[PDB]
Amino acid sequence: AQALNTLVKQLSSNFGAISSVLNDILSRLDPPEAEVQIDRLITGRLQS
Amino acid sequence: QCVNLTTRTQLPPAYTNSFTRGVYYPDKVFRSSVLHSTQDLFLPFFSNVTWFHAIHVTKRFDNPVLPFNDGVYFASTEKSNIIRGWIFGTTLDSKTQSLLIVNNATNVVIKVCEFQFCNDPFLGVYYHKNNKSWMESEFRVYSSANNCTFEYVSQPFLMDLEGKQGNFKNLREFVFKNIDGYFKIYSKHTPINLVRDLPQGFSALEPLVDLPIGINITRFQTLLALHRSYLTPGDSSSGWTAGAAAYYVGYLQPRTFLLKYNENGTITDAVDCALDPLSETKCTLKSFTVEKGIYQTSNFRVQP
Amino acid sequence: TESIVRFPNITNLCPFGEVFNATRFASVYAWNRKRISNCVADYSVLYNSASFSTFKCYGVSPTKLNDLCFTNVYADSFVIRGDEVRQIAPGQTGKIA
Amino acid sequence: LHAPATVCGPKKSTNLVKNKCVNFNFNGLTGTGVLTESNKKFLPFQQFGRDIADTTDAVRDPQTLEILDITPCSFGGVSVITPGTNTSNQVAVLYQD
Ligand SMILES: *[C@@H]1O[C@H](CO)[C@@H](O)[C@H](O)[C@H]1NC(C)=O
Numbered sequence: 001a002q003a004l005n006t007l008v009k010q011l012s013s014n015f016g017a018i019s020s021v022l023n024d025i026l027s028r029l030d031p032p033e034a035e036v037q038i039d040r041l042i043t044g045r046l047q048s
Numbered sequence: 049q050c051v052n053l054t055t056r057t058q059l060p061p062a063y064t065n066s067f068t069r070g071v072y073y074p075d076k077v078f079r080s081s082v083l084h085s086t087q088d089l090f091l092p093f094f095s096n097v098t099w100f101h102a103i104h105v106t107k108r109f110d111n112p113v114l115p116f117n118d119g120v121y122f123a124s125t126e127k128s129n130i131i132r133g134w135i136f137g138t139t140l141d142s143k144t145q146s147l148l149i150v151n152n153a154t155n156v157v158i159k160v161c162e163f164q165f166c167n168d169p170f171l172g173v174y175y176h177k178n179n180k181s182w183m184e185s186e187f188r189v190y191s192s193a194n195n196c197t198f199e200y201v202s203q204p205f206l207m208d209l210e211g212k213q214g215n216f217k218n219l220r221e222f223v224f225k226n227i228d229g230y231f232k233i234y235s236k237h238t239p240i241n242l243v244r245d246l247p248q249g250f251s252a253l254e255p256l257v258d259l260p261i262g263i264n265i266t267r268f269q270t271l272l273a274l275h276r277s278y279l280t281p282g283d284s285s286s287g288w289t290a291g292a293a294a295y296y297v298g299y300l301q302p303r304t305f306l307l308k309y310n311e312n313g314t315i316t317d318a319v320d321c322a323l324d325p326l327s328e329t330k331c332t333l334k335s336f337t338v339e340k341g342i343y344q345t346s347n348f349r350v351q352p
Numbered sequence: 353t354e355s356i357v358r359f360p361n362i363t364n365l366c367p368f369g370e371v372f373n374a375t376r377f378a379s380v381y382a383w384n385r386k387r388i389s390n391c392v393a394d395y396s397v398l399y400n401s402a403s404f405s406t407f408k409c410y411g412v413s414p415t416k417l418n419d420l421c422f423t424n425v426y427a428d429s430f431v432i433r434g435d436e437v438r439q440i441a442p443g444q445t446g447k448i449a
Numbered sequence: 450l451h452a453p454a455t456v457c458g459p460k461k462s463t464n465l466v467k468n469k470c471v472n473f474n475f476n477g478l479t480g481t482g483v484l485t486e487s488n489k490k491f492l493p494f495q496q497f498g499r500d501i502a503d504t505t506d507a508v509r510d511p512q513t514l515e516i517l518d519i520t521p522c523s524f525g526g527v528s529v530i531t532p533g534t535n536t537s538n539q540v541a542v543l544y545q546d
Pocket residue numbers: 311312
């Protein structure tokens with residue numbers, strides 16, 4: 001249970017991006033710029 | 049317009065301990081049946097607040113200009129309901145803008161202007177005999193007003209003048225906060241009776257209003273209602289005309305609180321992280337029923 | 353199967369023109385600020401007209417801004433020499449900033 | 450800062466539908482899922498909730514001020530039962546949950 005919790009809770013973190021939700025990223029920023037923020041989110045989520 | 053009243057003798061200060069009292073919902077987001085830990089401005093869980101016996105009755109009055117620092121918790125309880133508003137500001141004069149909130153039996157008004165507030169402000173009412181009814185025309189709170197940039201009106205949210213006496217003490221609680229150009233006010237209202245005039249029970253403050261007003265505030269003072277009486281020349285008396293009143297004031301601090309949102313989406317239990325080592329355990333474990341054992345709550349280093 | 357959109361039915365327009373062509377502009381040391389809220393803004397008009405030399409958006413893309421909602425908008429106004437325009441940007445060091 | 454929105458864009462609010470996976474956009478917050486009537490109320494002017502994560506569990510309709518709950522729509526892994534290509538070619542699919 002602990003592991004699962006701490007996995008799902010890691011979705012709340014943004015790992016240095018401007019937001020923790022991909023929907024906010026893709027609604028606020030254009031693809032060429034949102035690419036780097038999504039890169040940060042991808043790296044953080046993959047590591048977790 | 050201007051009116052002044054002073055007392056040579058000054059009522060002494062008084063400190064009183066404060067229990068769980070003073071917990072408010074930290075965010076506008078909703079939650080339910082979950083334990084959530086968040087850092088925000090709360091008054092320490094067991095905190096020595098300043099209790100003011102503002103009006104006593106052979107009678108004396110208190111008009112203090114209390115300090116303000118990153119939020120304030122206010123509490124009161126009385127049948128007369130003398131308290132009828134607040135004033136906030138860096139200087140409380142025309143030199144800079146200042147905030148005023150006033151309440152009546154039918155509406156609540158809020159304004160931001162360079163008010164020239166008096167040193168002993170109050171709102172006066174008297175029983176007009178011609179109209180055979182109470183009248184309110186003595187706004188002795190301020191001397192002048194200018195540059196009325198921001199104004200707002202709302203309902204009499206908690207001006208309920210219940211006609212009950214005895215074991216029906218009514219408690220009104222408020223929290224004022226200033227964050228990034230927002231003056232945000234939470235409040236709660238509940239009848240409870242205890243030996244002391246502030247119960248140890250646990251309840252949460254709901255968000256009352258939010259004003260998007262940018263201002264620097266470090267001072268504030270209460271507003272009290274004075275019921276004038278027809279003092280004829282034979283009496284040859286004049287001065288304060290109001291019943292006894294008192295309240296409690298406390299200063300918020302940046303703390304981490306763990307709150308227990310119930311099934312109905314209500315918080316009825318919370319713990320302060322820094323209050324006690326046991327509360328540190330409860331916070332780090334994100335629970336209230338800590339099992340027997342030894343826990344690495346946190347870490348400490350001798351500071352330089 | 354379907355996509356829905358829900359916004360409050362605020363049938364009012366509050367363009368920023370009253371601030372943009374304000375005849376008098378405050379000094380930089382006394383930069384003017386205006387708060388706008390509770391209204392619908394058509395941001396397209398802002399960037400659809402060839403009337404602005406620099407239009408730089410930080411943390412949000414101008415194209416998508418017509419499909420976003422916000423709590424409040426603070427419009428700041430001042431005047432500076434063109435060479436120092438770049439100083440108005442986060443993370444910039446200079447006397448003006 | 451996840452607060453009620455007062456500034457919006459020029460987008461007409463479409464009709465609200467329930468019981469089917471839809472791509473929703475409520476006063477700025479965008480997502481997708483099935484929408485239903487929530488089983489409990491918020492504070493008098495508390496307008497959405499959350500689950501253990503930042504994913505939204507409930508939302509208040511900005512048009513009708515009605516409470517609603519959101520659930521991710523039917524999803525899951527898919528596997529297939531195959532007795533071996535070198536013995537047959539039919540296969541039976543299995544949707545996990
Ligand atoms: C929560 O809601 C249920 C169902 O309406 C009710 O029975 C219960 O009393 C509520 N909780 C409290 C603390 O009143």
